[PDB]
Design an enzyme around this catalytic site. Structure first.
Site, PDB file in Angstrom:
ATOM      1  N   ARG A 177      16.983  25.254  30.102  1.00 54.10           N
ATOM      2  CA  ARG A 177      18.105  25.323  29.161  1.00 54.10           C
ATOM      3  C   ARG A 177      19.301  25.984  29.886  1.00 54.10           C
ATOM      4  NH1 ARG A 177      13.768  26.942  26.880  1.00 54.10           N
ATOM      5  NH2 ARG A 177      14.492  29.119  27.209  1.00 54.10           N
ATOM      6  N   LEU A 349      -2.298  22.340  32.381  1.00 57.40           N
ATOM      7  CA  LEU A 349      -3.393  23.179  32.845  1.00 57.40           C
ATOM      8  C   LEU A 349      -3.417  24.539  32.151  1.00 57.40           C
ATOM      9  CD1 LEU A 349      -3.240  22.332  36.600  1.00 57.40           C
ATOM     10  CD2 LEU A 349      -5.122  21.793  35.020  1.00 57.40           C
ATOM     11  N   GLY A 350      -2.319  24.898  31.491  1.00 54.74           N
ATOM     12  CA  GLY A 350      -2.194  26.213  30.858  1.00 54.74           C
ATOM     13  C   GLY A 350      -2.581  26.165  29.394  1.00 54.74           C
TER      14      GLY A 350
HETATM   15  C1  HEM Z   1       2.852  25.828  24.232  1.00 59.87           C
HETATM   16  C2  HEM Z   1       2.658  26.026  25.541  1.00 59.87           C
HETATM   17  C3  HEM Z   1       2.766  24.896  26.585  1.00 59.87           C
HETATM   18  C4  HEM Z   1       3.168  23.613  26.443  1.00 59.87           C
HETATM   19  C5  HEM Z   1       3.689  22.880  25.180  1.00 59.87           C
HETATM   20  C6  HEM Z   1       3.066  22.985  27.752  1.00 59.87           C
HETATM   21  C7  HEM Z   1       3.395  21.679  28.045  1.00 59.87           C
HETATM   22  C8  HEM Z   1       3.133  21.039  29.240  1.00 59.87           C
HETATM   23  C9  HEM Z   1       3.442  19.647  29.533  1.00 59.87           C
HETATM   24  C10 HEM Z   1       4.091  18.676  28.527  1.00 59.87           C
HETATM   25  C11 HEM Z   1       3.049  19.388  30.795  1.00 59.87           C
HETATM   26  C12 HEM Z   1       3.138  18.039  31.544  1.00 59.87           C
HETATM   27  C13 HEM Z   1       4.532  17.853  32.168  1.00 59.87           C
HETATM   28  C14 HEM Z   1       4.659  16.493  32.820  1.00 59.87           C
HETATM   29  O1  HEM Z   1       3.771  15.619  32.651  1.00 59.87           O
HETATM   30  O2  HEM Z   1       5.663  16.300  33.545  1.00 59.87           O
HETATM   31  C15 HEM Z   1       2.488  20.621  31.330  1.00 59.87           C
HETATM   32  C16 HEM Z   1       1.982  20.747  32.604  1.00 59.87           C
HETATM   33  C17 HEM Z   1       1.627  21.944  33.173  1.00 59.87           C
HETATM   34  N1  HEM Z   1       1.585  23.184  32.558  1.00 59.87           N
HETATM   35 FE1  HEM Z   1       1.780  23.488  30.502  1.00 59.87          FE
HETATM   36  N2  HEM Z   1       2.579  23.903  28.665  1.00 59.87           N
HETATM   37  C18 HEM Z   1       2.380  25.089  27.981  1.00 59.87           C
HETATM   38  C19 HEM Z   1       1.888  26.275  28.503  1.00 59.87           C
HETATM   39  C20 HEM Z   1       1.606  26.478  29.843  1.00 59.87           C
HETATM   40  C21 HEM Z   1       1.306  27.751  30.456  1.00 59.87           C
HETATM   41  C22 HEM Z   1       1.205  29.073  29.668  1.00 59.87           C
HETATM   42  C23 HEM Z   1       1.090  27.552  31.767  1.00 59.87           C
HETATM   43  C24 HEM Z   1       0.735  28.579  32.856  1.00 59.87           C
HETATM   44  C25 HEM Z   1       0.814  29.908  32.714  1.00 59.87           C
HETATM   45  C26 HEM Z   1       1.273  26.128  32.024  1.00 59.87           C
HETATM   46  C27 HEM Z   1       1.095  25.507  33.231  1.00 59.87           C
HETATM   47  C28 HEM Z   1       1.206  24.169  33.457  1.00 59.87           C
HETATM   48  C29 HEM Z   1       0.990  23.559  34.742  1.00 59.87           C
HETATM   49  C30 HEM Z   1       0.565  24.258  36.055  1.00 59.87           C
HETATM   50  C31 HEM Z   1       1.251  22.095  34.563  1.00 59.87           C
HETATM   51  C32 HEM Z   1       1.214  21.030  35.658  1.00 59.87           C
HETATM   52  C33 HEM Z   1       0.072  20.028  35.574  1.00 59.87           C
HETATM   53  C34 HEM Z   1       0.338  18.943  36.590  1.00 59.87           C
HETATM   54  O3  HEM Z   1       1.526  18.613  36.872  1.00 59.87           O
HETATM   55  O4  HEM Z   1      -0.656  18.372  37.100  1.00 59.87           O
HETATM   56  N3  HEM Z   1       1.601  25.497  30.833  1.00 59.87           N
HETATM   57  N4  HEM Z   1       2.559  21.603  30.358  1.00 59.87           N
END
Ligand code: HEM
Ligand SMILES: CC1(C)[C@@H]2CC[C@@]1(C)C(=O)C2
Ligand SMILES: [K+]
EC number: 1.14.15.1
Length: 405
Positions: A177, A349-350
């Site tokens: 943002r 992954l989170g």
């Molecule tokens: C409400 C909480 C969260 C939502 C809605 C969310 C949403 C997402 C989404 C939509 C993606 C896929 C993005 C894409 O395909 O380009 C993603 C990937 C990922 N998220 Fe979450 N996220 C959340 C919390 C977290 C947290 C807390 C962490 C780590 C502390 C995290 C780590 C990651 C990582 C490492 C990926 C990469 C997976 C990959 O590219 O293979 N996320 N997240």
């Protein structure tokens, strides 16, 4: 402003939606994005905003495109183009096959086994923060809970000092943002400037924190490079500082405004996990996308190699074609369809850490402060971008209606 219309884009598909400042924002950000799902709007539109890009407006298309990494590459996943080009986080900036090996390493630091070593500390911090607010009869929920709860857990996990939060949170927010003071490239370079010395230090002298684990990790049996570790750690910071943080505020705003949903969860606490999932659908908040790897006709529309397409994870669950009465929150909803945590090979992954933080928050907040409201005369303002959020959430309650555990 509005970018010149590319020669291959027909006028009838033009809908100048601005993902960083949508016109209907005052209605609520999900409502503002949902204008893309009015009956007269095609499944796939072109906006001239933010440099010009496609937007898939329906779950069917969003899911299809996330599955098809052949045509829809993660190499340039953010709008505007300059941001997507500079974006190099791992694993997100990679397509299969090379992406996959990095997921296992990221799982070692934010995956379910780690939620287990954190469980008690998550619970303890939620309870402490909420008990501190309880007797006050008011709080600024964004600053007083939504930020410090998930952020301090992440900083603990990552072995980073809490006094670094203001700087790191500012940088993270410029990637999702931007206030205009920094390009994505500048924010990213500043984040890397922070991480570089720390990654060196922890490769020399490993600890047990997430940065040490990533920096000394292996990927499919060979050592991670310093470069790769940096690009992974940057992503973990952004996930830690700008995902759950925003989602908690949408959820708590909703609960402040809906006493009967509060009462439902107080009376039937076993419903909290289901409520978490329905809230994840209704207050979904992420929208990134992909870049076309070749010319491609998709749902009758000619896409050109290099075109960007925004594939809003937010929108799939709000689509009436995926869930009836989609703006209604029903904790008993039988098939809660959503892509809130993504779709395809990049599934979040989170998400286990996220769900734990959400569920603990709902249980521990309603235990202590069952009866609360939006502050007198407040109009809650949202903000939109790659991750959407809530600008401020002033809550009030009568301390006599609360319970110290
Ligand atoms: C409400 C909480 C969260 C939502 C809605 C969310 C949403 C997402 C989404 C939509 C993606 C896929 C993005 C894409 O395909 O380009 C993603 C990937 C990922 N998220 Fe979450 N996220 C959340 C919390 C977290 C947290 C807390 C962490 C780590 C502390 C995290 C780590 C990651 C990582 C490492 C990926 C990469 C997976 C990959 O590219 O293979 N996320 N997240
Ligand atoms: C889109 C995301 C939510 C996902 C995790 C953090 C985020 C901003 C990314 O760059 C990938
Ligand atoms: K890139």
């Amino acid at each position: 402003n509005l970018a010149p219309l590319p020669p291959h884009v027909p006028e009838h598909l033009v809908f100048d939606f601005d993902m960083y400042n949508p016109s209907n924002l005052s209605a609520g950000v999900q409502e503002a994005w949902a204008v893309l799902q009015e009956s007269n709007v095609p499944d796939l539109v072109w906006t001239r905003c933010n440099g010009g890009h496609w937007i898939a407006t329906r779950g069917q298309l969003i899911r299809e495109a996330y599955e098809d990494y052949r045509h829809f590459s993660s190499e340039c996943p953010f709008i505007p183009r300059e941001a997507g080009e500079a974006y190099d986080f791992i694993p997100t900036s990679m397509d299969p096959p090379e992406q996959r090996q990095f997921r296992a390493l990221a799982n070692q630091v934010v995956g379910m086994p780690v939620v287990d070593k954190l469980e008690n500390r998550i619970q303890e911090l939620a309870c402490s923060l909420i008990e501190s607010l309880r007797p006050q009869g008011q709080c600024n929920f964004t600053e007083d809970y939504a930020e410090p709860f998930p952020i301090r857990i992440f900083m603990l996990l990552a072995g980073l000092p809490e006094e670094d939060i203001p700087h790191l949170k500012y940088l993270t927010d410029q990637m999702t943002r931007p206030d205009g003071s920094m390009t994505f490239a500048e924010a990213k370079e500043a984040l890397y400037d922070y991480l570089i010395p720390i990654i060196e230090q922890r490769r020399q002298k490993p600890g047990t924190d997430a940065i040490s684990i990533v920096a000394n990790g292996q990927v499919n049996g060979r050592p991670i490079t310093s470069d790769e570790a940096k690009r992974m750690c940057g992503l973990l910071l952004v996930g830690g500082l700008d995902t759950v943080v925003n989602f908690l505020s949408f959820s708590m705003e909703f609960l402040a405004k809906s006493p009967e949903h509060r009462q439902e969860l107080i009376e039937r606490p076993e419903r909290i996990p289901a409520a978490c999932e329905e809230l994840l659908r209704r207050f979904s908040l992420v929208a990134d996308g992909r870049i076309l790897t070749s010319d491609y006709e998709f749902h009758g529309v000619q896409l050109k190699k290099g075109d960007q397409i925004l594939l809003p994870q937010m929108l799939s669950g709000l689509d009436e074609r995926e869930n009836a009465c989609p703006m209604h929150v029903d904790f008993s909803r039988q098939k809660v369809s959503h892509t809130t945590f993504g779709h395809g090979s990049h599934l979040c992954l989170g998400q286990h850490l996220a769900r734990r933080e959400i569920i603990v928050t709902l249980k521990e907040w309603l235990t202590r402060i069952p009866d609360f409201s939006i502050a007198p005369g407040a109009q809650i303002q949202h903000k939109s971008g790659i991750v959407s959020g809530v600008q401020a959430l002033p809550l009030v309650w009568d301390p006599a209606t609360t319970k110290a555990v």
